[model samples]
Target chain A: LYPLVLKQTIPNLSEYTNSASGPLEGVIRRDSPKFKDLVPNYNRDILFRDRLMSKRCKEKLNVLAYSVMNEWPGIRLLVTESESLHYEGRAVTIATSDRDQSKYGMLARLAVEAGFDWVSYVSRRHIYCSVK
Target chain B: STYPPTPPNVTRLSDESVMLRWMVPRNDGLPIVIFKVQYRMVGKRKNWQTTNDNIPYGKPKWNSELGKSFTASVTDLKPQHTYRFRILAVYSNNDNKESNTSAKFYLQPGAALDPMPVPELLEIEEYSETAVVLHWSLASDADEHLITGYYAYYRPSSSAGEYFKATIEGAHARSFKIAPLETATMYEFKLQSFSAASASEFSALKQGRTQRPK
Candidate 1:
């Protein structure tokens, strides 16, 4: 079971965490019970049609996702239920930006079309990630 | 010395009708003194008419019944006519005086439907920072009337939204220098001639766009 995961850079941790906790302190562990129930069955269906059997497809997707992570380290992300059957085999994209709050959706869409199908860049306020 | 020192400005309501609406003259210092007004269609041989400052004739009548500001109908007049009118002020001294004559304004009695003059050979030779020079043949008037003045209406080709009007009165020469125009712009011009009672329709449109500096 693979999970739909979201990650973001938290500039300030105090809002969500204090001396008793850090910015990521309360986040569920990969194997935590709270996340186990939400894990997706990657083997049950072709979850991402854009994925392929060839090694080149995996390499391309990895490269695209890596570039998004490296270029925008502090961006936020969120995972939501896929609402359309037309996109049943696609993973959602999410991202962050330092400027032009409106550009996140555009940037994420571009990244996904470039092979990062599982992620999307969204508006800055979407995740409400506390700055570290 | 009165509140409304003079009557309302006479305005052209139509080709033959004129509107006059003025504030009542101040009655503070002077006793109630009525006006004795007179007018005439202006020309070389003026035909003057008088009014009691109250009653009006069918050809020339006071519309004061409508209100203090009313129209004076001048019917059966020639088209594109020019008329000069004056009003006299009578005071409590029983002495009478008249205000200076108002400036003349041309009245276009009807739409210009007559055949337009054909433009002759023309050129825009001289160039300036603002305006391009244009030279054109002095087209002849279709009618037998003597040409009294010229009117030029021009607009840019890119944005020929509306034409701007410029008049050259009593101009004997054919050439004129236009000034302060848009740079790198195309312009269209139409020429017109006016006589005593009528003005010729506009000439065919001419166009020239200025060249940009290298």
Candidate 2:
């Protein structure tokens, strides 16, 4: 299993309109916000799906993202950078899952290619195997 | 032109043991044929460990009488190590070449006994007005151990009281700068150590407030 950190952002019209002002001195919080969610896990159902059957929605979502990386010559560096950034803010670390074997190998190879000393994987479920 | 010998297949029976099985090339009525097996570490000089050289050499009965296949069991191999193996089909005419080595395979050493190491004497040093330096000492362990590295956790004194985490690989340097911290704010910090077998319990909590201009 391999661990991955994902990044996401939402368009904030109010911040965009406030351009050069310091913290929007004369603006009011907009009525009915343009976006309802701005977290990574939001709309997870829309993004996570079995590839064989969900090709169309998946492709549309991929283009919508700034960029998505996976596999050799795919998203290796992007994934590593994103993970480094996520570590900056996360509270707990967990193991990787079997569902991500292919992606994990790709990430491992990329890390190797990037001159990393070594790489290993842990399953998130392994952490909870023994309960107190 | 003759039928190629069957390729060897490997099955890992345990962390240190593996089972290798193979079939001899089908016989054609040209000349009597012989077989040999060789192996070595992927990059090391080859070791010529032969089974037929000790006794009757030509088409030995072990080929057909060993219950239809050779059940050679190997032991003492380490887990998580990649190994390459190949088989050679030697015919009586002095002609031979090896089949492609099997794909690299890592034996998942059984569940690691402990997942990480326990950090020692974790400390934080003030680096600048907006940054604090973090440091810690690590423990050494057995040959089977895989100590990946350490993680640092910290939180600003002014925030809602939560810790953020970051990881660094086998980083030998004892210090890292916690930069861009808010000026003149106390920051609590701690360190956790990790290995393939286990993770050390977190270090005693420590804190260092960013420096303030007097």
Candidate 3:
């Protein structure tokens, strides 16, 4: 219905934290134990804007994740570099290199449906959405 | 190989992957140091690629039966992409040799990994003496999200003959062109959706008749 459920909705940020010390670029490995039920499928290896170092439960702000390079048109997490999503400030950010306007409108609409009422445009690639 | 190692033989392992095996060069007494595997999608004006897509750390291995067999496993190939491959052998003496590139290969996309939603046959779009146009629909999001392609099947409606199939690419594709038909005959059409390798059940039968020769 919504591409896929997060499984845990607000799953663990530990995988991101665990890979923070490494140069995490590209898709997350699909077979990684790092994401055992966190997201619907794999990790995108895309990270939060910056490491949220506060180390507070911080209310675990269930941030949203969207992959620009996903299968077909939706966020197919079961892929390699596969895919992983994270959280911060109760907002959403997408990883993509595609600038097709139709995709932008499509993903934006998807974000809107996912409860991210606020949408921002930048680089004409990333979709930034946030909610109170 | 005359001097350097020969090109590797490519063996398709699965619908999505392949295994490459080559021979060990004579080295002329010099040790062979590296087997560099290279590939690229066909029809793209891009440089050849060296990828982590190759497995076993992209290194060569010895085989007893195959004569110092060297190999690389290239995996995760998709149907939408066509590819070509080649190899290079590097020697300890700073000398390297290249092999002939492989013929282009198209990894046909498979059906969905799971049983797909049933397809709904729509009315015949149109038809000519030589061809018929077909259309169908997907009722749920499952179809939109999972369909990689469609297999359009058809046969003479008057006889109980097995249907011949034509592949239609694109998930958003709702129509197909079945061509070169006999004039003044009725044809039955059926459709099935597939993704990954899983094909959904066939759609309800629909019929269309070609116009008689004018």
Name the candidate that leads on lDDT.
Answer: 3
| Tens digits of lDDT, candidate 2, A1-132 | 112111100111121123211131222122424212112323332233212211222233333222223332222121211122122211111222233432433333333233222222223121100000
**Candidate 3: regions farther than 4 A off:** A1-132, B1-113
User: Cα RMSDs of all predictions?
Assistant: 29.6, 26.1, 22.8
User: Model 2: share of native contacts present?
Assistant: 0.00
- Provide the TM-score for each candidate, comma-separated: 0.30, 0.29, 0.31
Candidate 2: tens digits of C-alpha lDDT, residues B46-105:
332322221112323333432223324345665667665556544343333345556665
lDDT of 1 by residue, B1-214 (tens): 3222244345443455443323333245433144434455667755444432321111111223432222232333344666554454333432233444445645665565343333342665437656665554554543423555555667786563545544555535355555556667778877665443344555677787666766
Summarize candidate 3's per-residue lDDT along B82-188 as a digit string, tens digits: 78877755444433445777777666544423557778898875578877888777886664677767767777896764355456668888888776677788888
TM-score of 3: 0.31
